[PDB]
Amino acid sequence: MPAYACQRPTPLTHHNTGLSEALEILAEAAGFEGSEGRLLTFCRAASVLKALPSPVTTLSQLQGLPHFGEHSSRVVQELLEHGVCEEVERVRRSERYQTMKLFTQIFGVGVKTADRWYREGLRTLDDLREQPQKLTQQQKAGLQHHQDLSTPVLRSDVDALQQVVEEAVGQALPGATVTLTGGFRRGKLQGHDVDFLITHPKEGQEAGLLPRVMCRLQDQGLILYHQHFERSFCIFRLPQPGSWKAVRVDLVVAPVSQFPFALLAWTGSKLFQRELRRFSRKEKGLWLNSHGLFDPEQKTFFQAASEEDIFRHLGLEYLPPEQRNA
DNA sequence: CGGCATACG
DNA sequence: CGTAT
DNA sequence: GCCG
Ligand SMILES: [Cl-]
Ligand SMILES: [Mg+2]
Ligand SMILES: [Mg+2]
Ligand code: NA
Ligand code: NA
Numbered sequence: 001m002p003a004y005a006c007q008r009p010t011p012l013t014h015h016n017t018g019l020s021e022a023l024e025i026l027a028e029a030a031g032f033e034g035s036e037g038r039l040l041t042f043c044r045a046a047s048v049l050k051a052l053p054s055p056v057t058t059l060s061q062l063q064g065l066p067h068f069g070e071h072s073s074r075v076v077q078e079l080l081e082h083g084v085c086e087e088v089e090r091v092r093r094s095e096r097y098q099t100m101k102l103f104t105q106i107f108g109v110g111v112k113t114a115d116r117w118y119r120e121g122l123r124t125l126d127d128l129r130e131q132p133q134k135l136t137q138q139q140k141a142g143l144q145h146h147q148d149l150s151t152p153v154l155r156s157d158v159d160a161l162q163q164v165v166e167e168a169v170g171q172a173l174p175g176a177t178v179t180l181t182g183g184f185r186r187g188k189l190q191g192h193d194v195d196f197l198i199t200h201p202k203e204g205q206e207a208g209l210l211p212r213v214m215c216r217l218q219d220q221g222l223i224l225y226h227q228h229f230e231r232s233f234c235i236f237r238l239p240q241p242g243s244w245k246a247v248r249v250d251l252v253v254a255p256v257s258q259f260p261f262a263l264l265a266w267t268g269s270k271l272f273q274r275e276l277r278r279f280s281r282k283e284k285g286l287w288l289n290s291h292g293l294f295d296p297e298q299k300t301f302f303q304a305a306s307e308e309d310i311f312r313h314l315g316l317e318y319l320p321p322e323q324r325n326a
Numbered sequence: 327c328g329g330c331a332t333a334c335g
Numbered sequence: 336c337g338t339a340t
Numbered sequence: 341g342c343c344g
Binding site for chain 1: 336337338339340
Binding site: 233 | 329330331332333334335
């Protein structure tokens with residue numbers, strides 16, 4: 001079992017679902033307390049289990065797996081022995097965990113804002129609605145739309161949204177293209193937002209594109225919220241039988257020279273990309289981001305024409321998006 | 327022990 | 336500070 | 341929390 005998640009296939013569904021979910025609770029709780037190192041370790045340990053070819057049934061099967069030390073091994077041991085891990089259950093029922101989860105799920109609220117509100121004694125969404133002068137406009141939109149944004153987005157929703165984005169993109173810049181990214185490109189059947197990447201085959205033609213797209217969507221009455229650039233974090237009005245619902249949509253523009261890097265980055269998963277960037281820098285001495293891959297010795301950028309190019313230039317076996325679900 | 331991904335709004 | 340993979 |  002390789003030590004980096006980008007060195008091994010990780011499918012969307014797997015054979016250790018309960019064990020990985022428990023470790024991911026501890027990762028999330030670590031993040032709520034600002035412990036980024038422990039969050040990473042628990043996420044990595046969870047991801048190792050997702051990559052295994054069969055269920056873990058005995059503690060000895062963890063021997064030699066990367067990212068399993070005393071703490072993660074004890075969690076697994078308790079789940080195998082008793083079906084429950086007391087630490088995990090203690091986190092789950094705690095007022096701190098439940099409130100930080102509720103608050104950080106709000107669009108416009110991060111861990112730092114949630115933690116401050118918690119320390120002020122706030123606990124519920126209606127607590128927040130009672131003092132709206134404290135909220136940013138983004139937080140107001142996140143709170144107004146919270147119920148809809150909590151409802152899973154389905155594949156049929158994605159197909160509808162892609163058509164309306166393509167229509168607006170086509171008037172904004174003929175020849176521009178729209179690619180579905182994020183979790184839906186990795187094969188998810190449900191999600192909580194939809195991610196799109198926009199480019200144009202002629203380098204430079206994509207400059208200034210996103211304002212033109214957003215204005216056209218807003219004039220069609222489809223935008224319930226946006227920040228007004230190359231990234232837009234929107235709330236869309238999606239038609240529903242007899243009504244509609246609010247959906248989070250992210251629109252990203254990249255020049256075609258950078259498209260493979262942006263596609264790779266925005267397809268994720270989040271942990272896959274962190275691990276890939278860590279692998280690039282620490283094992284290969286190259287600096288990876290959503291714009292390119294830089295050789296800091298020669299001071300040169302690697303031209304890529306495809307995701308396959310990028311995996312080759314990092315010495316990694318290619319993984320399709322469906323196997324990047326770290 | 328240091329390190330833990332890297333960006334944009 | 337928030338957002339994203 | 342775990343790795344090199
Ligand atoms: Cl980036
Ligand atoms: Mg997404
Ligand atoms: Mg997200
Ligand atoms: Na949030
Ligand atoms: Na998104």
